[PDB]
Amino acid sequence: QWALEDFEIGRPLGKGKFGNVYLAREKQSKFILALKVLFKAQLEKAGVEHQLRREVEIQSHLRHPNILRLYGYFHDATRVYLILEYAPLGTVYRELQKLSKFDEQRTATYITELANALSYCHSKRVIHRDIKPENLLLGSAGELKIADFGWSVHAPSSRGTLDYLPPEMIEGRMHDEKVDLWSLGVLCYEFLVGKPPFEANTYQETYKRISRVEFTFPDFVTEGARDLISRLLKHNPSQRPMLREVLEHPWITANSSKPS
Ligand SMILES: Nc1ncnc2c1ncn2[C@@H]1O[C@H](COP(=O)(O)OP(=O)(O)O)[C@@H](O)[C@H]1O
Ligand SMILES: CC(C)[C@]12C[C@](O)(c3ccccc3CN1)N(C1CC1)C2=O
Ligand SMILES: [Mg+2]
Ligand SMILES: [Mg+2]
């Protein structure tokens, strides 16, 4: 159906490991969108065909305002093209670099939107497994949108930076929905502080800090945020709260600008 000739390509939006993402306009409708370009040789050498199929399959059937739409795909002799919803306000990653850290209200609002999207996913027993700032995008009204479903699967299951991964996943053990709850805790901390809680200089040390759950709070982190973050970052996945508990947490309801 679709081919390259149906699109006018514009400025580069961002780069990933495989993805090279461009602004584009569909010629006949003038529909503005983002084109994620992937190199077949690279996908082949890495052997990640199965991940790309999951990305296309999962994300094209999901329908939630806080989840980035994927409309379709095509391919030519050297490349694959994913047709995505364009997110005009950029990444949460960029916004964090701009401001250093977020206040409590901005943080709590992002966490609610995230918890809302993750709740929809887990209801279908879909787990994302790669929640982090560069994969969280912003809409025209500044609303958060989860993207990059390359690592997602159907729980239960086995299998760059370790910073967002829970102990059971890094230790090669088995995992479920609770992995996304650990990542949610890591994100809440990084939003308020400016860096992720287990960050270190080497892969080897980061691994040690994650598996031992070694993190501390700066003085300016309030009691409420401390309580929520400490509940999310439990070694034992079953001890981690449910998304409903997160959305009803006193610190969240006191500071968030959006509902569940
Ligand atoms: N729909 C989009 N709108 C705006 N920017 C995007 C969009 N998709 C991706 N980007 C930018 O391109 C980067 C890489 O995209 P991503 O799909 O995460 O690739 P990868 O799977 O290689 O990580 C993102 O971090 C973001 O900066
Ligand atoms: C025609 C065929 C060879 C294929 C199928 C493929 O696995 C795939 C997977 C998800 C989405 C699109 C496509 C494109 N067509 N693949 C990419 C190299 C991974 C191809 O080149
Ligand atoms: Mg990505
Ligand atoms: Mg990916």
In this structure, which amino acid lies at residue 194?
A: G
Active site residue 130: yes
- Which CATH homologous superfamily contains domain 91-255? Transferase(Phosphotransferase) domain 1 (1.10.510.10)
Q: Which ligand is nearest to the CA of 32?
A: 1
Kindly provide the resolution of this structure in angstroms, with one decimal: 2.2
How far apart are alpha carbons 128 and 60 in whole angstroms?
Answer: 14
Q: Which two tokens stand for residue 193?
A: 């502080």
Give the method of determination. X-ray
**Domain extents for the chain?**
1-90, 91-255
Of all protein residues, the one whose alpha carbon is nearest to atom 23 of ligand 1 is 16
Phi, psi dihedral angles at 237 (to 5 degrees):
-55, -40
- Three-state secondary-structure class, residue 28: coil
The reply to whether 87 sits in an annotated binding site is yes
Ligand 1 neighbour 35 (Cβ under 6 A): no
Ligand 2 neighbour 79 (Cβ under 6 A): no
Ligand 2 neighbour 73 (Cβ under 6 A): yes
How far apart are alpha carbons 128 and 152 in whole angstroms?
Answer: 4
Ligand 1 binding pocket mutation candidate from 59, 66, 83, 137 (most atoms within 8 A of CB): 137
How far apart are alpha carbons 158 and 246 in whole angstroms?
Answer: 26
The reply to whether 40 sits in an annotated binding site is no
Strand 70-75 versus strand 79-84 pairing type: antiparallel
Q: Which ligand is nearest to the CA of 13?
A: 1
Of all protein residues, the one whose alpha carbon is nearest to atom 10 of ligand 1 is 14
The full DSSP string for 148-203 is --TT-EESSB-----TT--HHHHTT--B-THHHHHHHHHHHHHHHHSS-TT--SSH
- Residue 192's closest CA among 169, 219, 171, 164? 219
Burial of 220 (0-12, 13-18, 19+ CB in 10 A): exposed
Element (H, E) at 68: none
Rg of the chain over all Cα atoms, to the nearest angstrom: 19
Ligand 1 neighbour 19 (Cβ under 6 A): yes
Of all protein residues, the one whose alpha carbon is nearest to atom 5 of ligand 2 is 49
- Residue 229's closest CA among 118, 113, 107, 85? 107
- Which CATH homologous superfamily contains domain 1-90? Phosphorylase Kinase; domain 1 (3.30.200.20)
How far apart are alpha carbons 59 and 160 in whole angstroms?
Answer: 23
